Each structure stands twice: as structure tokens, then as C-alpha cells.
Write an enzyme that holds these catalytic residues in place. Structure first.
Site, mmCIF file in Angstrom:
data_model
loop_
_atom_site.group_PDB
_atom_site.id
_atom_site.type_symbol
_atom_site.label_atom_id
_atom_site.label_comp_id
_atom_site.label_asym_id
_atom_site.label_seq_id
_atom_site.Cartn_x
_atom_site.Cartn_y
_atom_site.Cartn_z
ATOM 1 N N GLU A 10 0.788 -1.229 0.000
ATOM 2 C CA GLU A 10 0.000 0.000 0.000
ATOM 3 C C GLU A 10 0.828 1.290 0.000
ATOM 4 O O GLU A 10 0.330 2.362 0.335
ATOM 5 C CB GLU A 10 -0.992 -0.008 1.175
ATOM 6 C CG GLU A 10 -2.139 -1.011 1.007
ATOM 7 C CD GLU A 10 -3.093 -1.039 2.194
ATOM 8 O OE1 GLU A 10 -2.656 -1.383 3.307
ATOM 9 O OE2 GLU A 10 -4.293 -0.741 2.021
ATOM 10 N N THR A 15 -0.235 2.933 -8.148
ATOM 11 C CA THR A 15 -0.834 4.209 -8.519
ATOM 12 C C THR A 15 0.103 4.960 -9.487
ATOM 13 O O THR A 15 -0.337 5.559 -10.466
ATOM 14 C CB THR A 15 -1.150 4.996 -7.251
ATOM 15 O OG1 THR A 15 -1.976 4.171 -6.428
ATOM 16 C CG2 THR A 15 -1.895 6.265 -7.542
ATOM 17 N N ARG A 145 -8.159 0.483 -4.846
ATOM 18 C CA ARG A 145 -7.181 -0.309 -4.129
ATOM 19 C C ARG A 145 -7.381 -1.791 -4.465
ATOM 20 O O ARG A 145 -8.444 -2.362 -4.197
ATOM 21 C CB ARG A 145 -7.318 -0.057 -2.623
ATOM 22 C CG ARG A 145 -6.172 -0.566 -1.759
ATOM 23 C CD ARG A 145 -6.311 -2.036 -1.483
ATOM 24 N NE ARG A 145 -5.273 -2.551 -0.589
ATOM 25 C CZ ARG A 145 -5.512 -3.096 0.606
ATOM 26 N NH1 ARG A 145 -6.757 -3.189 1.067
ATOM 27 N NH2 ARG A 145 -4.507 -3.586 1.327
ATOM 28 N N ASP A 167 6.153 -3.706 -11.850
ATOM 29 C CA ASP A 167 5.432 -3.526 -10.606
ATOM 30 C C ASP A 167 5.175 -4.898 -9.972
ATOM 31 O O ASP A 167 4.821 -5.847 -10.668
ATOM 32 C CB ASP A 167 4.129 -2.802 -10.950
ATOM 33 C CG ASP A 167 3.263 -2.511 -9.749
ATOM 34 O OD1 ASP A 167 3.762 -2.474 -8.605
ATOM 35 O OD2 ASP A 167 2.052 -2.326 -9.969
ATOM 36 N N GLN A 171 3.381 -6.621 0.009
ATOM 37 C CA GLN A 171 3.073 -7.350 1.236
ATOM 38 C C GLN A 171 3.978 -8.567 1.394
ATOM 39 O O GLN A 171 4.437 -9.147 0.413
ATOM 40 C CB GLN A 171 1.595 -7.731 1.300
ATOM 41 C CG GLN A 171 0.688 -6.515 1.568
ATOM 42 C CD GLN A 171 -0.763 -6.889 1.840
ATOM 43 O OE1 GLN A 171 -1.130 -8.076 1.859
ATOM 44 N NE2 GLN A 171 -1.601 -5.875 2.036
#
Ligand code: GSP
Ligand code: MG
Length: 310
Positions: A10, A15, A145, A167, A171
């Protein structure tokens, strides 16, 4: 030019990927935006549900008892949103819940649980997104998200340079996949969420999110394999950090912090905390930029500057 985006979960990596399309291509088409319609609804329903779930655990009551019946209806009707459908009735149930004082009090204690950054963005724009024939805007798309799994590859041309951007998920369960992208990297854009300083990992509620970021950066920055790779540090979510620093002490993360609760002082301290991890300070440079990944104009100018460094 091969660019690899790294950073914890996150942090804003995905983005930035979406911005390259908006900036270097022509943005998302009508068909592409409509694909995100279900993610927006899903993101919205999950946000209100995460808040209602936390009220139970923290023992927070609704400001108005009738909200109890709306909470019941929410679950009965939630299934549709998941399928990309939003009924005026569902929109009404959620809007009434969002305005409740008990719900807002819990909303303001979000660091005590896990809540999407975009919760308020969507919840406050319910009238617009619940419209018949609603089509996500570019910003709605940038606000979605979705946890990244696998390896995403994107290409684009800019300043006569052909870019291949990679990308991956940040996590814990996805970090084992990072090694697959380690070949021929021109530059690494390491993303850090400035607003993570008072939050804990979704994967572990005992671990501070910012400390986890530091460990990762130290790991990447000093890896022999990346000696000749440029390291660009994006201290992201500066918009959220700006509002959070006023009401949440940085000492929660860095007990030794002796500066004031102002953006400029707190931001500079965090920058030095990360830059200090670089062990080859005389022979290895780190290019730091403060960003708001959802702000296209900001990302446009920062990327301009970055490509010149490239
Ligand atoms: N307000 C605000 N939200 C941002 C910013 N950058 C990212 N976001 C929001 O944060 C959420 C998560 O960002 P995302 O890009 O999915 O992270 P990620 O690093 O790719 O995460 P993962 O795939 O490793 S789990 C998204 O809803 C995104 O819109 C920012 O600077 N400001
Ligand atoms: Mg991602």
C-alpha cells in the site's frame, strides 16, 4: 530504460503505474473506466464494513439507534455492489451510516484497525458514484485499491526513451517474487508512505509500518547487485501526512524526534532517517522526491525531473 517499483504494501507503487498511462498515453478509455466500476463499489462497501466491524470491537455505539436497522440492511444488500451494481436504496443506507456521529468517531480512530486510504474519498462522493450510468473518472481509477500479485509489466515512450516499468506486490507474501525482476534494472523507484508512521502492518499488528519500510530500504539500497542502479526514493502520500502530523505525534514512530508537529520539519526528519541507511554515502547517491501519487500534475513534474536524472 528498465524501471522497478519497490516498497511495502500500500505504499503507492501501482498508482504510479496508472499515472504513466494518464500522462504518457491518453488516460483510461470509457471501456477501461467501466472495468473499474466494480472495484470502486467493492472498495466503498469494504470501507463502510471495516468501520462497522471496528465499532463492535472498540465498543462504539451509533449516534442514532435507528442506524442499527441500516447496518442490518447493508449486509443484506452488499452483494449487488460486489457485482458492479449500486441501487439507490444501498446508496441511501450507506450515506446515512457515514453521517452517523458514532460511525465518524470510529472513522477517526482508524489507526486502531485496517482501513483503506480512499475510504473518505468515495464515501463523501456517494451521490456522484451511486448515479445511474456512473462511469469512473480518472481520479476514481487512481483511487482504487487492489492488491498486486504476480508481476505487471507496462511500456511507454517518453523523451524518445522507451520505458519498461515493472510492478510487484509489497506485502510479505509477495516479496519472495521480487528476485525474479532483479535483472538489468536501470533505476529503482522505492515508494514509502509518509502517513504509515502511526499504523501497524496488516500482516502483523505488532509491527509498525514505517519501521518495516526502513528495513526493506536498507536491504535494497545496500545490495551489491544494485551498485550501478540509480535509487530514487519517493516519500509518498504527502497529502495524508500533512493532515496527520497535526493530530498524531511522530514520536509514536521515532521516540527521539524533538522537532515540532509541522510538515516541513517532520518530512525532513523522515527523509534523513531513510537516507542515513545508505552505507555508501560517498559513492552512492539517493534521489529523493516527496509525492502525492494520486495527483497527476505532481507526478508529471516529479517524473520529468527523474527522467533527467536518468
Ligand atoms: N491520498 C493518497 N492516496 C494515495 C496516494 N498514493 C496512493 N494512494 C492510495 O493508496 C492505496 C494503495 O495504493 P497502491 O498503489 O495500490 O499501493 P501498492 O504499493 O501498489 O500496494 P501493493 O500492490 O503492494 S499491496 C490506493 O487506494 C491509492 O489510491 C497518495 O499520495 N495519496
Ligand atoms: Mg500494487
Amino acid at each position: 530504460v528498465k524501471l522497478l517499483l519497490l516498497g511495502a504494501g500500500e505504499s503507492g507503487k501501482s498508482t504510479i503505474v496508472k499515472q504513466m498511462k494518464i500522462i504518457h498515453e491518453a488516460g483510461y478509455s470509457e471501456e477501461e473506466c467501466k472495468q473499474y466500476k466494480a472495484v470502486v463499489y467493492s472498495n466503498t462497501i469494504q470501507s463502510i464494513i471495516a468501520i462497522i466491524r471496528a465499532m463492535g470491537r472498540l465498543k462504539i455505539d451509533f449516534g442514532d439507534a435507528a442506524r442499527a436497522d441500516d447496518a442490518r440492511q447493508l449486509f443484506v444488500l452488499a452483494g449487488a455492489a460486489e457485482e458492479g451494481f449500486m441501487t439507490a436504496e444501498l446508496a441511501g443506507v450507506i450515506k446515512r451510516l457515514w453521517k452517523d456521529s458514532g460511525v465518524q468517531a470510529c472513522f477517526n480512530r482508524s489507526r486502531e484497525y485496517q482501513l483503506n486510504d480512499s475510504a473518505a474519498y468515495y464515501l463523501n462522493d456517494l451521490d456522484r458514484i451511486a448515479q445511474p450510468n456512473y462511469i469512473p473518472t480518472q481520479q476514481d481509477v487512481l483511487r482504487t485499491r487492489v492488491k498486486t500479485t504476480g508481476i505487471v509489466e507496462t511500456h511507454f515512450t517518453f523523451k524518445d526513451l522507451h520505458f519498461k516499468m515493472f510492478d510487484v506486490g509489497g506485502q510479505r507474501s509477495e516479496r519472495k517474487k521480487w528476485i525474479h525482476c532483479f535483472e538489468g534494472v536501470t533505476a529503482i523507484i522505492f515508494c514509502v508512505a509518509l502517513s504509515d508512521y502511526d499504523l501497524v502492518l496488516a500482516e502483523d499488528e505488532e509491527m509498525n509500518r514505517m519501521h518495516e519500510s526502513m528495513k526493506l530500504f536498507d536491504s535494497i539500497c545496500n545490495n551489491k547487485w544494485f551498485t550501478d542502479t540509480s535509487i530514487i526514493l519517493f516519500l509518498n502520500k504527502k497529502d495524508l501526512f500533512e493532515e496527520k502530523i497535526k493530530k498524531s505525534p511522530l514520536t509514536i514512530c521515532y521516540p527521539e524526534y524533538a522537532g515540532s508537529n509541522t510538515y516541513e520539519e517532520a518530512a525532513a526528519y523522515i527523509q534523513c532517517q531513510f537516507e542515513d541507511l545508505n552505507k555508501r554515502k560517498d559513492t552512492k547517491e539517493i534521489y529523493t522526491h516527496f509525492t502525492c501519487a494520486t495527483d497527476t500534475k505532481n507526478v508529471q513534474f516529479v517524473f520529468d525531473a527523474v527522467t533527467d536524472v536518468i
